[PDB]
Amino acid sequence: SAKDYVDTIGEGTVIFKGANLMGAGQSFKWDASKLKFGMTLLFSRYDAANNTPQDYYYH
Amino acid sequence: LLDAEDVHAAKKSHTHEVATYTTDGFMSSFDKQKIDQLVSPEAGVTSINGKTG
Amino acid sequence: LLDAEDVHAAKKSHTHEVATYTTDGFMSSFDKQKIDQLVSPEAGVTSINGKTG
Amino acid sequence: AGRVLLDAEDVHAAKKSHTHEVATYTTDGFMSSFDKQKIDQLVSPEAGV
Ligand SMILES: [Fe+3]
């Protein structure tokens, strides 16, 4: 059970998967107890005219 | 031989339909695509000449 | 005679509690009405001859 | 035969304490906790004129 607990903390739970500019107004909330280590953010290249989330040049 | 129907139980894999204006349930894939990018500001006109509605 | 309870199985017509701050599940129907109001609100007049507030 | 123990497995039925996967962009399923945590704080549109 301890091994499962630490492994489940390590693999993490996805908060948002998809794509958005993350501009003014958008936000995300969660229970504080779900946070044990921290948060991770992944960004990618985007198209303003086409509005399709290209998949490369991640950060 | 017994399966879920004979014992009057739900299947191992099953769906509960979407949640409507008066019924609970899941959310349509469109709903999930809507909520994540849904934004707070809705603006509008709050009052004109001291009258609302 | 066997039933869903007799075999520790979910009832053929069973429902889950609505999701909370920590556990997932269904959403309340008026929550569905709320989110459907947030998307495409058409709530009143947004601007009257280019004027707001 | 003999003393037989029957649960939801041998009848291929869902457990009483069972949960479905959260809905995705192309999948239908439970509404996530943080989805509701985002929804409730989202103020309802203001009805003026
Ligand atoms: Fe179920």
Side-chain angles (χ1 to χ4, degrees), chain D residues 26-38:
Chain D
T26 62
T27 318
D28 220 310
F30 274 165
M31 94 94 73
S32 76
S33 303
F34 25 75
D35 270 304
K36 152 167 299 303
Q37 197 99 18
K38 182 175 173 177

Side-chain angles (χ1 to χ4, degrees), chain D residues 1-6:
Chain D
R3 185 53 39 95
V4 282
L5 255 300
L6 211 53

Side-chain angles (χ1 to χ4, degrees), chain C residues 22-45:
Chain C
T22 49
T23 180
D24 309 4
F26 292 174
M27 49 164 90
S28 85
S29 69
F30 98 106
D31 200 299
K32 168 74 159 114
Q33 283 159 168
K34 205 218 184 306
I35 169 181
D36 280 359
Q37 280 150 9
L38 272 291
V39 161
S40 77
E42 54 272 2
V45 159

Side-chain angles (χ1 to χ4, degrees), chain A residues 16-17 19-20 24-26 28, chain B residues 32 35-41:
Chain A
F16 153 64
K17 173 195 160 208
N20 65 336
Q26 301 93 323
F28 290 86
Chain B
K32 163 70 61 151
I35 170 61
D36 73 339
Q37 289 206 27
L38 183 69
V39 66
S40 181

Side-chain angles (χ1 to χ4, degrees), chain A:
Chain A
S1 277
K3 308 275 214 51
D4 173 328
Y5 177 69
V6 54
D7 283 318
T8 36
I9 277 159
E11 101 180 353
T13 89
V14 46
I15 285 308
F16 153 64
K17 173 195 160 208
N20 65 336
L21 279 312
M22 182 68 40
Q26 301 93 323
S27 55
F28 290 86
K29 244 61 163 191
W30 54 77
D31 164 30
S33 80
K34 309 276 210 65
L35 189 90
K36 326 293 282 297
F37 275 57
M39 100 162 48
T40 81
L41 299 86
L42 183 48
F43 301 73
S44 315
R45 192 53 161 295
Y46 203 74
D47 312 317
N50 303 56
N51 308 54
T52 167
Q54 300 190 80
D55 303 297
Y56 56 104
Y57 292 3
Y58 285 68
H59 168 42

